[model samples]
Target chain A: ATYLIGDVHGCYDELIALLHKVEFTPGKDTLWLTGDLVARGPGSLDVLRYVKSLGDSVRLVLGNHDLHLLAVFAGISRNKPKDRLTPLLEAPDADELLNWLRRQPLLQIDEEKKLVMAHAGITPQWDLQTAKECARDVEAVLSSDSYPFFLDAMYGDMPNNWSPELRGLGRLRFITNAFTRMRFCFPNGQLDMYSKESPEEAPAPLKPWFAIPGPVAEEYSIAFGHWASLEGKGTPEGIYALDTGCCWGGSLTCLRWEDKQYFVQPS
Target chain B: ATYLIGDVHGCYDELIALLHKVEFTPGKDTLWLTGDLVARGPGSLDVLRYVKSLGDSVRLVLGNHDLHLLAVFAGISRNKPKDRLTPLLEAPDADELLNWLRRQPLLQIDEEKKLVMAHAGITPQWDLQTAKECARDVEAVLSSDSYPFFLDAMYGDMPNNWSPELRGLGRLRFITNAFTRMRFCFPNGQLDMYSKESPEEAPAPLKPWFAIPGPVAEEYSIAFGHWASLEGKGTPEGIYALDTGCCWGGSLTCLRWEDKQYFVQPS
Candidate 1:
């Protein structure tokens, strides 16, 4: 069975329980993690090690929290006190774990299954092919020696709206932000980075990215995290919002792609 | 009492023992640490928290390892696997501890005592006043909003020697490298950054910066760490080398400024 799990946020115990509930088989079963493996919980180090130990059995995409972790590691951002990522950063295997994370893709695709996974929802301006191409562009830089350049320019919210003409760090930044940070946006497709309120509380003119009706909305069915307020209820028809705010005293959620079954471990 | 402690390198147990051996009196006693407070040992988190808990009683100068930690935190450099800084990076009080570390000065001075403390040796070309002024320039950038620039430019070994004509990040980089990473240099003040061997094994043209004969060398009594192979032996007449490689299974050494007495806590 292919298991799609949502934001761990260093909640090691819940992840372990959820794995047990799913009766995870390391070599035989594949685990698709919805990014954000670390931060905001007591056991990021444990979570990282556990996930990393699983080897080729796990599939992960970059989340906002995940990118933030890399950004902190890269010296572009300050480490927040609340992140609880220090143990992982200080761990004996920190470099190994971080390197693995850095090498991971921003988007994971299953074309045969007509499914896509990203930390945040894709922009309405990009179709499935375009999203995958943009993700590949960012991933190429992220996996290359020039990654520090990307990490350096990745902090800002400039070019809030995406365009094909964006170049250099600006292009990478736009692509990264769209796939990992976007939550609510105007119908014009301009991202509202400042607003983290749930879809209900978001200011008028700002609707969930997937909710904005457009040609791109008909692309692939996207499974994403980074916005826990959606409460596993993805906006629009073709989205699967998986983050259930597990690290925020919510529950660790998993979606069985085979039967579309949901398994939740409430803390 | 005023005490000057050597490179900690995350040896919390030894640091505690040395503090006890010196009979530290908290508010009544002031500790001038030679930096590298966290790295290459088991208890960087413990060391950082312990030192931070001491409040105003501690005065620290940043070392190469300490700066590396900041660089990693700031996203300028990758965290080395062997540094063991992950626990501190992952700690609940990580942000507070890191902010405290960031706010610390690169050099500490006791004018009346005629003693100066830094993590690494001062350049032989700098008089006490010139050194202090240059240190302030770097400190200003380090503690300001543009510090990320400094952290990014601080890594390389180019412009291996200092000159007053150096400007911008290059000047700041030169100053920071001299204060934290300098170990040996040529008689003309060119830094031998690539050499980590003991003084006896240093190349013919290279001499310890403190040993390079000059009027600047005699300006004041300087205390520093960052060179564990020095084995508590400072160069020339007024310099004091205090790093005893405590994190490498050596001893934690300290100097009593009032009596010029030495305390050693051998592991």
Candidate 2:
């Protein structure tokens, strides 16, 4: 299974075009999505329907907008008329798609193969196991009938520190936020969720999560997206950076996991 | 009874001093608090307890910080040291104080006197009744044991416009935000919670909820607090703002309902 791609943002037709360009075959070839399959564009429903129907063929990591969808569906966030997500929310099969989407792992790891995948890059504080668990906490709630409860729980940035002692919704949300929306992180592993500018402008004691030193998840090769400001050029070496903000006129990037060869094109 | 206060932010000493200056005698003078009794200062627990003890003489409204406290206690918000609210959360009387606090009306009316008291100013679009009902929806949750669930339901900025059809947590949070935190709102009546500079510097089309044209709760005089930047300055007639930024080294102000005597002095 080889995979790589950046933010899709509900560009269903473009995604289909990209898949066609790659000669993708469902089930036979595993496809990697670097999160954010919904929002901004005009075809979020189609995108969700297509990806959800694929089941195991797609390795989906949580993106910020994807989490926002879960939040909206769970009733934490609201559906905007211009969001292009109305149809999905109104879809008859919405619950199923939402459940399946929630069940999707936040972090993907090749383990022995020396590779990992996530919607956003891993903070140096989280190793593979922590990342996987973080994703699972969110997945559990999303898959559960209590999804709305968890969704409601998905607000705020308290207990900003990632700790084993953190439990329930707080812990899960921290994990989801860290893996999906994380860009810069501090040496203490406290995520800096606000800095949208480039890394140069990131505040003192804050660096892109994966680049921080001193034993914050040092065990695996991490792959991530979300911060297109980095332009697929990761600050830290070894970790894979996939999202090139293709929907925003950057390239739609793909990497064959087998050889690390990259495939990309302008939107 | 006439009341004006806002964003006390845990400044207990100022409130006490102001009460004394105004000669707020129990059983004689009615004391009204326009929300935000805690957070950002020392002794939030003391402030809540002191207000709780006032019982009939006092009417406390829920502010954003008060709701944040409930969220923190319910684990909706994280318990972080910077918040400085743990004493209140851990207080033995926390449950009672929270209940009493939530039970406090969003808009209190002394119909005979023609004064409407609220923690934050009301949007001109909503008359007193509509605003009261909206407040009830959120206050109901706050009073209910399911308040924790509401805490979970709380947070978000969607459905940006106010509507009667808006239901569940989205609507609840919207109404709560309006009653507690709103200062200047966008043209769509959506709250722009971050613009604390002043009404003049606010982004276009976003005016104080009271400034919206037409008869939006114009029949009654509304009393409110929580906009400390105003320094007790608000445009609506009969609307009194008593929060003098006690924590910011500003004065603690009080207005006598019977005589309209303005009490202002450095905290």
Candidate 3:
């Protein structure tokens, strides 16, 4: 069996407890993370090492906070005092962990199983194939020797929509935003870059990305975790939202892929 | 009007002459090349700049020879004496020209016109969407900071077929092969990588990629080069083979998309 997990946000103890509750057998079971493995809470360094230790048993996509840590690590951005990533950066194994993290994709697909995973969500305009293509575009840049160029170019909000014709840094930035920071957006996919409100409080014309019917839903079931305000309640049948806000004195969550049963551990 | 030209093989003068014959009016028309922009001729550097100078009016894919140049540029491969790319490497604007060339895609699609172009051809197993996604995978790495990794990993023939489950260098290498070196393959899409014989001489179970009745043929018309023994013949309607072998003392070929008429420049 496999497990799909929510945002950990450096709640390393809660994550360990949750894993035990789920009866995880590393050699027999696989775990997939929806990112935010670091930041906000204490033990970000421990979290990084623990996940790295899991090796091939783990699959991950990067979250916005994860990218934020990378930016600071690469010297493209400064760390916010509360981010709690400094210890991880100062750790001797930091480079190895960050290198492995950077190589992870923004999107992961099990095409035969018809399942997809991302940190936040995908745009309505793209199908599974197009989404994978766009994800690889950013992955290519992020893992390249010229990766620092993209980390520097990562901070932007313009052109907050999908266009097949989009190219270069602009295209990479837009894709990065969608996979890691997206939550609510116009039905047409014009992103509301600053919105962090719950669905009811969202401004006019904005809705959760997965709520809008699109080609993606017709093909693969999507699992994501960036919005914690839903409190683990707002999701359609095939769209699984796993963020339970573990970093904010909430609970870490994981869903068994085989049966959709969930296990949680409160911080 | 738009024109699609075949492999130039560094035959710069013939490319210029063929453009004139086709009345390729700059800014008023577009030129799409089936790529092999450089190699085996006296003017590979001249050919590189001439195409780069065309800017937005031109769209080109990467042929096997072009990838060979890039592999050499990335220091993953040694230059073959017959490649004729040393002058390009020594040119003052070599970096700019090579950068532009590396950024070019393995596939170029004009969706509205339902036209697709590749240096060689796509596998019959994929439809238009799947082909574009696979092309983007290699294009992403080739244009990214991690390009040298792919260049070094690109030489291989195992898993000489398309599988969605394929990953890492294996996947990238397979994609590079299909879009650059592919010609004939089994009906099941197992590539016959070493076979370059004319269609009639192709061993059993090998057929031209486009000749296979697949969903791609039912949708966009494909234009490709690389297979020259067709001598500008062999293709059915909706599939255009434009490589007339100008570098081999034959003729450079061009197909006008608007009128379906062709122009030739004898070597």
Candidate 4:
């Protein structure tokens, strides 16, 4: 069984808490993540080093801050004081850490179980096919020679809505935002690209991406993080908002897929 | 698989520590005790409260100290100050504690695994069948209408050797000693009621019981406690001496049956 953990954001203490709570054995079970593998909270270096040691037992999807971390490493973006990434950037193994982080996917799926996941979400406008291709394209570029070239143009909220005719950096940016930063969408299923507020508190015409009509992930169960204010709630059936804001003093959550059991560790 | 624990005495702190060490859960696993659950250590009351709450998750073979506790409860024997049992006697739930303790077996076995356990050990002369019947007879009286009467005569070390013709208290006493106190046997396999020396240091001819020949439980893996001076050793192949003298500041030990993995918590 895979244990799906929420955004860790460098909360190594809580990561250990959740793992110990579940008695997770690396050889027998896989640990899945909606990534934001490093940022904000303390111990990013420890979290990265420890999770890397797990080898084949872990899987994750990159979040916005995760890509931002790569950008910082590539000299395309500056570190924010609040993200507390200096310890990680200054670590002796920074090159190895960023190299590994760049190689992670933007989406993960269990094809037979029909379980799909992303750090934020697969947009309502993009069907499962689009989600897959978009994830695959970014993964290829991030792991290839063009890695720095693509990461430099990865930022910005333009072309937030998906378009099959979209090309180059615009096409990539929309796909990236949809999978890593999306929270709410226009009523017509176009990405709104703003409003990090909870579903109930958001202003007019901004529905949670899942609340829009055409999300292909809705046909199967989808697990995601990044929208920490949800506190692991506000999703309709089959959609799991696993992020409990552990990096923001909330609980770290883990779901055991075999039993649909959630284990939590409070920060 | 069941987790077999050695004599705990009353070291409740170490008991809790050992449980945490194994991450032992009550429902999915069973905890087996080689008795001496209470006596000569702190927190006997706590151990009973905690173990009793586990319900069907626990099994224990009564030890000499365990029987002594029962005798004291029944007013047949006086409590020793050194036993540190005043806390247990004065507990508000004392009756409930004693009643449950009295009902536990003098011998416990896993028929399929061919694993047998007791506080001392089954005698070399008694095969598995004899061991089972003898245990059943005493368990019947210990939990029955003759509970107090039988306990009154439960002490004393005569008829130290096993005999088919032995009757009444003599037969019961021999059975009790074999299960709860026997530490040594003569060269010919006759029980020697005294001597608490470690097997490495004991005087001639009086060898540790498992070192003798023709033992019934020796046919399979056997687990026993009570003789803590072994510090969890001095037995032949397949015979496990689990006691580690936790009451005297030694470690509390637990063996996971499936892998024979031992977990310990120091006092």
Candidate 5:
């Protein structure tokens, strides 16, 4: 059986409890995480080390908080008090762990099961194939020697809108924000990158990204995290909203792909 | 498989072509229609008769023009010369079709498929149960011998906001308008009949009804027509915008929910 879990956010205890609740076995059962693994909780170090030790048994995708950690490690950004990652940053082998983190992909698709996943979601403007192509483009930068430049250039909300012709840093930034930070968008695919308000509170013409009409892709179901406010709801039937406020004193949610049964652990 | 087609708008030739061109297998597949089956095209009588001919296969939800035709059938309202419904009115068997039209539902929901259909849309102010109840409240009158009174009384747009306590002409008109005439609306789901502009061009206080937050039901997917200007775009995902301007030199659209595949026919 395969399992997919929501944001850990360094909620190590609940993560373990959630695993135990589902009887998760490394070799016999595969675990998937919708990133945000290390931040805003007491066990950032424990969470990273444990997930990293999973080796071939676990699959993960990157989220905004995850990218922020990488930026901080590369000296591109300063750590914030709210993140609580200082100890992990100071760990003697931090370099080894951070390197492993940056190598993970932004999007993962189980073609056999027709499940596509990311931290935000597959952008409405880009179908599954386009999403894959964009993810690979960014992964290339992260895994190569140019990572230092890419990490430093990842900041800024410039070029807030998207165009297929977007090249270099603008393209990479657009893809990253779309897969990690997007929530609201206009009809023309212009994103409201700064607003985190729920659909009701959002100003006129700004709707949750998944609310937009288009085949994100036919026959492909999408799962994502990064918006804890959704509380495990908001997306259409085939699109899964997995981040159920795991580190906001809410439950850590886990779903078994075989039957869509959920096993949850509260904060 | 169950399929829902956009407004036919009296395009009988286009309707037959679309069905023959798409993945339709008569008894094995049920076809549902969002109304405006008559008026403004060369074959108002042909479209309505073809739909009525396919018994058990077609589920027709009445549109505003459908209601208008009923008013004219009852000798309560004068027919516009442009409607092209004169032949339909002259047909000797027209009484059977007219009575059947008035007997049709304002809302058709397949609980098994979790899809709801209406001419305009299910009101943002009403949930699935309330919509069903209100629609039935009006359907009761149309199916009765007293339908003439209700058809004449249905011509108003008063009492825009909904209330559980509403009754008589106000309740009936609000329900009718919401189901067949609505497009733009205020935040509280009050229909702004004065506005027919697109979402991008609409005024400050008015917005596309589906864009208004919290008005739609979370559990059910909605399908609607009548606003041909949208060109089958604009609603949030799960709330399908199906009109596609079939009568306004636009195409007829159909969606097979089984695979989320769409078929189109150009007018």
Candidate 6:
């Protein structure tokens, strides 16, 4: 049985509460987290430490915020002179935590469970093979010494849509959009990374990625957590938005695949 | 006959000298500018006055630097506060010139002559109609009071790909990109806005916009300016890049669309 949870942006207490509610014991039940396990909240470092302690029991993917943390520590993303991320950057053992976190996969596909997980949702434009290849491209850079170099040149608006022919930073950006930060996407798989103000507020041409036309809906079961606005609600049946927005004054929710039950808890 | 020129950047004397070299005769020839006609150089006021005085004889497109001038005058982009463009912005005729300049098309399709003029080169993947539509969206805002709002939301990394379905700011960015600045593009029609260097230093998988395989070359002849690095040689086949880097100590270049002939003078 495979269980999925949403973005945990350093909400260690909420994560713990939810873990207890789900009765998650590392040995018996496997837990799948939707990434962004660090940053933006009070106990991000603590969350990372605890999650690492969970060892092989946790299945995780990378998120945009996690990349920001890594980029900040890698000297790729600047401190902004005055910003909230400085303290977290200055925390001891930040190096180790970032190292471990950066090594995580961009997309996780469980063939036996038929579950595909990513930090952000996949656009219907891509199939599992294309999606996995793109994710690996990002993972290769993030896991290498050249990660800093990749992060350095990784800012721009080009190759916004995914294409197998995209190269260099364009390739990395395409993969990043797929795995870490995508929310709404235009029909051609262009992302609307702005407009975080709920789905209704999203302007025209910006639709939830799952609504994309073609074989995406009929293809596979996807799991993603990034847009807290969904509140863990994903329409279209097979698509799952695991993020219950634990950091948004909401509950930490989880799915117990064995019993097919939903569990919730508050920090 | 139609003529295209490059980044003016407010170099009035050079612009005048280039006109003389081309033996420019008012009313006899139609002049089309590729944008960036103002800012950063001496005599922006003179440049504006001359261009405005030319009336219908000249067709100018707006570049990012030209937009910066208007935004600064309106208090949207002011830093260090350069005094060069004060007269141009404050002149009794300034508003007329600015309003006219703003209303100018970011691109023009000379359907009869089979020529298209824009501030930047054509993306290999975009045909004449697709490029024209994108340019028009940006032109509407650049020509309107609501342009500042678009400017604020203009910065980000996602929405990097071109799609007709992109809406709001993402839509604006795609248009801004097609007009203000674009050089290289990935094969997927994704603009490579990074790398100010020449094509030699471009990363792997990235190529100049014109080199990508597509029907753009077979479709229509294009005239654009902004990249001075080409030294007015323009692209092979139907693409034209006329900026000639007049602001960067290079010459101003112009080509007559009637016969695709070149006229230029050193700065």
Best-performing candidate as measured by TM-score: 2
Worst 10 residues of 6 chain A by lDDT: A77-86
- Candidate number with greatest DockQ: 2
What TM-score, to 2 decimals, does candidate 6 have?
Answer: 0.52
Candidate 1 per-residue C-alpha lDDT over B137-208 given as tens digits, one digit per residue, 9 for 90 to 100: 877777887777878888667677777788876777678778888888887988766667677644466788
Write the residue-wise lDDT of candidate 2 on B29-119 in tens digits.
Answer: 6777777788778878888888888888877677777877777777675554555787888777887877677666776777877777777
Error of 4 at B244 (Å): 60
Give fnat (model 2): 0.00
Every candidate's DockQ is 0.02, 0.03, 0.01, 0.00, 0.01, 0.02
**Which residue pairs collide, candidate 6?**
A160-B160, A160-B161, B6-B243
Task: Tell me the RMSD of model 4 versus the true structure.
Answer: 25.2
Q: TM-score of predicted model 1?
A: 0.51
In model 1 chain A, which range of ten residues has the least summed lDDT? A212-221
lDDT of 3 by residue, B151-217 (tens): 8888887678788899887888888888888888787877777657688644466788877887887
Q: Score every model by TM-score.
A: 0.51, 0.56, 0.50, 0.49, 0.50, 0.52
- Kindly report the docking quality category of candidate 2: incorrect
Tell me how candidate 4 scores on lDDT.
0.83
Worst 10 residues of 4 chain B by lDDT: B197-206
Error of 4 at B148 (Å): 94
lDDT of 2 by residue, A109-211 (tens): 7667677777877766665567667767677767777777776776666556788888876786777677767777767778876666566534366677777
Tens digit of per-residue lDDT, candidate 4, span B81-104:
557788899778999888988888
Report model 4's TM-score to 2 decimal places.
0.49
How good is the docking of model 1, by CAPRI class? Answer: incorrect
Clashes of each: 16, 9, 4, 0, 1, 3
The parts of candidate 2 lying over 4 Å away from their true place are A1-122, A125-180, A183-267, B1-3, B214-217
State residue A129's C-alpha deviation in candidate 4, in Å.
1.3
Off by over 4 Å in 4: B1-267
